[PDB]
Amino acid sequence: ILKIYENKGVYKVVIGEPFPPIEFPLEQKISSNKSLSELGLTIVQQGNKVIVEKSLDLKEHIIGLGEKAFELDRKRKRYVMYNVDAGAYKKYQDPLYVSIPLFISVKDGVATGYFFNSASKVIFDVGLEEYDKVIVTIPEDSVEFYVIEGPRIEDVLEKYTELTGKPFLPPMWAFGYMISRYSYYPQDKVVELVDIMQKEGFRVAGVFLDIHYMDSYKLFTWHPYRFPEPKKLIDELHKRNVKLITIVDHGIRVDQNYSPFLSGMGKFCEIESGELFVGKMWPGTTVYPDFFREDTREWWAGLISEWLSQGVDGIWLDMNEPTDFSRAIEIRDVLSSLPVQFRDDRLVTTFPDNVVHYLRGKRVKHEKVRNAYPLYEAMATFKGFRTSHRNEIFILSRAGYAGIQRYAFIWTGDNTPSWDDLKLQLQLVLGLSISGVPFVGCDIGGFQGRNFAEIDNSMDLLVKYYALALFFPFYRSHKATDGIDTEPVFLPDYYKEKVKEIVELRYKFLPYIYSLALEASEKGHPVIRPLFYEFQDDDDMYRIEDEYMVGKYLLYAPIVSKEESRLVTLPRGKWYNYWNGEIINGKSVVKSTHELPIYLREGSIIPLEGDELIVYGETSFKRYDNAEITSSSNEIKFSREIYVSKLTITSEKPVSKIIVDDSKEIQVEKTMQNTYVAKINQKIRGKINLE
Amino acid sequence: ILKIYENKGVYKVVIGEPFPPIEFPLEQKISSNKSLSELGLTIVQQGNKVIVEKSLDLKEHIIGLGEKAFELDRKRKRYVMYNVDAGAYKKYQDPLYVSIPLFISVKDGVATGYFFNSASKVIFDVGLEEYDKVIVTIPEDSVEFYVIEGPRIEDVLEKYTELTGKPFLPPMWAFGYMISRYSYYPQDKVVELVDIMQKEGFRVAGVFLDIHYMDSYKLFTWHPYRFPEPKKLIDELHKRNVKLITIVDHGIRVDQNYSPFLSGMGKFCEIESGELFVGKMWPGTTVYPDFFREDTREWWAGLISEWLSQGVDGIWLDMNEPTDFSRAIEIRDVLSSLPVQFRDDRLVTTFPDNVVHYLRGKRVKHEKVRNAYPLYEAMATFKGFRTSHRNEIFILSRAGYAGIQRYAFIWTGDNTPSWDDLKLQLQLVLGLSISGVPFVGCDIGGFQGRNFAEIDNSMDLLVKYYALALFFPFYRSHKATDGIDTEPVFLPDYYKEKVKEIVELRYKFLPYIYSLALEASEKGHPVIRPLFYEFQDDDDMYRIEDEYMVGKYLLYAPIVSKEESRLVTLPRGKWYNYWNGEIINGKSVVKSTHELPIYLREGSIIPLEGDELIVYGETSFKRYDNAEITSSSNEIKFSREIYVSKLTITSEKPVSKIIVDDSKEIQVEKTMQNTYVAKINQKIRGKINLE
Amino acid sequence: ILKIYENKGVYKVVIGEPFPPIEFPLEQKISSNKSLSELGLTIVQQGNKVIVEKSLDLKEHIIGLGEKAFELDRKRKRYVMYNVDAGAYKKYQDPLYVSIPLFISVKDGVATGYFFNSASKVIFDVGLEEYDKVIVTIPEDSVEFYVIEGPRIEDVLEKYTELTGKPFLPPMWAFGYMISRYSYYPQDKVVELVDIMQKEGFRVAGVFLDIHYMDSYKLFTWHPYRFPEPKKLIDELHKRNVKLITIVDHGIRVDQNYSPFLSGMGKFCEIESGELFVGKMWPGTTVYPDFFREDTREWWAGLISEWLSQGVDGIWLDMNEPTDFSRAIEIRDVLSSLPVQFRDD
């Protein structure tokens, strides 16, 4: 059986009788006229497997697949989609924590998307098995996938987001500077550190509490000695306008007197033979919630809601691949004596094969729906915020699947501090971003501490991390237990000042970043983007990976080496050097002039902290507070009255004066080449004219 | 800290501040005038260990230690007391399922007992480390042991039994012929087999239902297909006057919808770190009841009581060493693939070292109290019978500790059919018997089926098993799943008739056996006894192991070889050949005359089936129904009026007539040498005279 | 039984009845009016172990611990003090060759020292187990440690040095440019190299001779073919004003005709059961001097003295962790043929 449904440039191809890990609504199920051959696809059904083939041309680009430790153009590699605890991952390691079975093809400048809605171990052989083919193997007898027409990459993502879910809109503080560690404690130390940070000028949005805050790693408990007074801790942080985010794993301790274990009974994962799936995790012997069940989701939402009611501001979901250590520990117990070195097979940390779940009333094998586990956990956790009537929602997840963007931010896990990691992190967050997950980031400074030689803890590298993630949506510093203290307040003045200036610059651009976040939640456009996203028709762009676009207007080329300057590749069009005012013509390579290489595209409007505003060329932009700004000839229109402090206009033609609402004239000042400034400091009814 | 108490030939030596696995009430608490020196003991306290030394003379005998696969005189061996699933045990394998830390020394004809009340891994080095010493090592810093004065071995056992508990008095049917298998099913087959057995003349007292009757090995459940109508089965069997005994393991399946798991929550064993101890047993992933706790014992008694209420007549406790297979399975998973062979270390089936229990409110390590686990399980099960107001109690246990005789019968586990096993089983049951556990037996025909070459399933060997256990308290035929069918009804007429006659002979002696059972429950005297028990002053007796005494009057020398006759060693005194009537002088060796070599001691009274009575010499005997019979010069007195059918008097001097109550007279018919019979068939108010 | 003594800013804390690896004489003792709580310490005695705790503030610095492949400020790491042959060590590898159980705390600009006089496998958990604590675990039931007041770091070191011993004053040439290799030989090549070095303007203070100079790695012997005339070599070096330093390991070859083995008999290390501890080192099967004994030390001093009398200027003690390879070799013999990779423990 083969059915093809069409609507809005999205074709739903159904092979056999699929049982999706999650059902995505289609607001118009119209049988399509186009056939597989007109779609350029070949399909084969074999021993409980479905193979989908597509040709691959020499100049064709393949992007997506989410979190991959590889170049953005995915050709010449066989990818595996299977959520796994990657440990201290290195480049070219696969698979990782997140699985987004979506890839976009750009041929002759036209983009087309392919989304396979299966959470099983899907294989994407991109021109490896057959140099001229993309072969997708789904380890199931049935499957549903979608062909998403473009022609722009942005067009594919809008439709994809429409299909799987728009990103939730988080609070502005979720994009602030977060400090974290594994872990901060006891409670008095948490407050002491926050005080020193603030006293030295660092604006801290929130602090993350890792597993040391729990009582014997038991979820929803406070360590009796380190955190005897949770209320005191909470009020002190809130008193300092600092949010508190607490980590929450997925393992429930098999403890006779542990409430969650007793109340969750009946809603835990089982194994083929009917018993509970008992494994090993932080709290020791543990069982896991079967988040695929509606009731398990309701139970979890309740615990979360109750947990949030103490004043906790956010939830950090970890180890939710889902991960289990019983197999690893079993091996370590039997061969512990032997003086031999074990191989590091990460797949050993996934759930065993005999584990089963109940999806929509049906009993299914874990291997068929594994990757959607974190999605359902996030869903239940999001539901927990609703149950608490909490409008400001903040959820961080390590693992994910298509649709995860509806409920959480995703960070790249346990990275290793090193110069090469700077480039790796950029590929990771951009891969995730181009795959439908907009709110992403990495651990600034790297997670790994000092448990192995290949770790670089130099301070100038640390500064480069802060600078690298300058525009990442999620900006958090996190470090392992045995790692050196990486909080800015512990750095020599020389380095401390640099971090301080970088963080201040981030807050200065927060308004723009947040506006892009609103755009993401409304249209599904990613916040940070690889250059080929805005210039998909230029093949060169698919090889540029140490540069990224922030929204549609800002190009950032972070310095990812020890050099003092770097070569910057500029796409077609004109670009304005943010720091010295120079305007360069696109499709060229130039040398960076500042430590933070920022360029504005001709046709930009950028809202800055303190009601500042930068305008260059003609375009239209919607600020996060709903205020729309439009620039044309020599006029800047406002959808509604708004305050404007400092206005910066970049222009090749001189600007002698501006006129507010036809009457008042404000003094213009040339601050540098092509740069004109006007100190307005007043509300504007609806427009400004340039002369 | 050394303290010695005393009360009527029982010295209680306390080293340090002991925390016994179970507390044994000592009548008084009188202090002793004796010192260790006077008691012939040396004591040392070291690294959490207590070493107790005693000298050992060349002619000194050491007996006891319970279930040991060794000669009855224990010298020249280092014994370990640690309950363990022995698997397919062979001779000289140690340790086994039961641990009774009691040994009796017989020096210069005088017996003295030594009981160390510790359920930890106690070591009894009997003249091995030091040829002239008995060294006992208790792996604890404190300990309480008792020195029990004799001078007769029977004296020691009475005091010992007084201390640890008198054996319960079971119903007479508990000593009948029991058929069992692993397993009988479905329910219709159980009834069909019982019918054939009865139709062919075999009087079956009860049938045992092994684990196949359960639903997925879940305790207290019936297999929906094999036993869909258990109530019907129980009536079908009860209608035929056949008892039903069901096996009950100690593992509770970790199942979300399994009632016992949910109701037992809070009462299961834990590990050092606080989580539940999750292991592996028949039902798969399992937890175990912490029987050391008072509340757990109540909970268990409730389930048992409820289980007994359907009409189940007896409980068979198995795998209660306690045994666990998680370690073994862990090894098999990690090294399964290797073409390498594994060593059979039985200790791998015991509970792990991190398991803890709550004894009398105190948290203790499993290794300190392990051996008492089965004792507390039996205790709770016995309590379950009381809760059901069930007066006829029947409990079979595989493992045990001192005091187990208060609650259950013990059978020797998984023996292997073979000619050598005949001698082994005799040492096992006699060792248990001389150690305070009177109601014992072995699997007639051997448990092991055909899973390995060294198994002998010949029919004449099977017949020898039936004959060997002729007088054992517990008489049950049990066989493994893949073993040939061993029920008598499946044997060729030649062999079937032999088994039939042996079973009929057992029922003929049941009255005597049961009277000895009453004596056991009242005075703690064992039913079957090694020869040295009645003749402890003759060194020769400690080397005789293929002969045993049934009570004080009957000597049985079973044929444990293929021969047609054997050499029989007779102790001091005169002995009457039960089959040919010949009388022989003790302290001699004679050849057997019948297939079942039975001899009556001068001074015997033996009640037989159908009110028959055998009298030889002068003695006093208490029948199970309380009627006391006494024989003197030429008179047989009765404590109360009782019916008497056939009376047999063995005498070297002729007996022409007997006189009932100084009135009526009955003629005597000499049936064979020294044998005179009188068909009385009438009640006797109080006496019979011989002339 | 925990007591505290005092003397010129040095608090000696005694837990139980310690048997120090070496005794450091503390002159005018006298019991202290100070308490542990005042001293800011917590002490626990358990299963043959002593745990000493101190709080650790956010701005507090911890330095010391000797030879550690880590940042100078030691916070956030659990250190092990156990001399070990580190092999081709990399950064963040622990432990290494040297064990100095001393750490200095600098809080509010004030320094205080803590010296635990135990040569056992001492653990220094510096804000790792507990973020706000420094936990020191000594695998012994008794122990003596010292709290050394500053307030300057230099003050702490002066007192510490006063306690454990002042550094000896070596000759000025010991700080000159030394050339070495594993190894330089035969003897003519040693002189040739020194000549070229001097001719090209390099002022060489001394040359080190590694194990290739010995006869089959036997201590206090000269290789019969590589070094047939050691006297001539020493004279040539001295004529050129170059010192000669020779390496000396700690392994004595179990050789029936090897003098040091025969003369050292009675002074070697043993094992619990009473036999000699026979191991493996450069010369093959070897025994080791029990330097903890006075007679062994005297015997060794004699061999050294005799060795120095030929004109050797310095001694280079190597592999003295002490190191032994019998366990490693045992593993390599049993799993030699197995096509697997051994972990480097």
UniProtKB/Swiss-Prot annotation, chain C:
What GO MF terms are annotated?
alpha-1,4-glucosidase activity; carbohydrate binding; hydrolase activity, hydrolyzing O-glycosyl compounds
Any GO BP: carbohydrate metabolic process
Q: In which compartments does the protein localize? A: Cytoplasm
Question: Is Nuclease a UniProt keyword of this protein?
Answer: no
The residues that cross the membrane are: none
List, from the UniProt record, the residues annotated as the active site of this protein.
D318, E321
Listed GO CC annotations: cytoplasm
Q: Which family does it belong to?
A: Belongs to the glycosyl hydrolase 31 family.
What is the protein's known function? Major soluble alpha-glucosidase.
Protein name stated in the entry: Alpha-glucosidase
Which species does the entry assign this protein to?
Answer: Saccharolobus solfataricus (strain ATCC 35092 / DSM 1617 / JCM 11322 / P2) (Sulfolobus solfataricus)
Which part of the complete sequence is present?
5 to 347 of 693
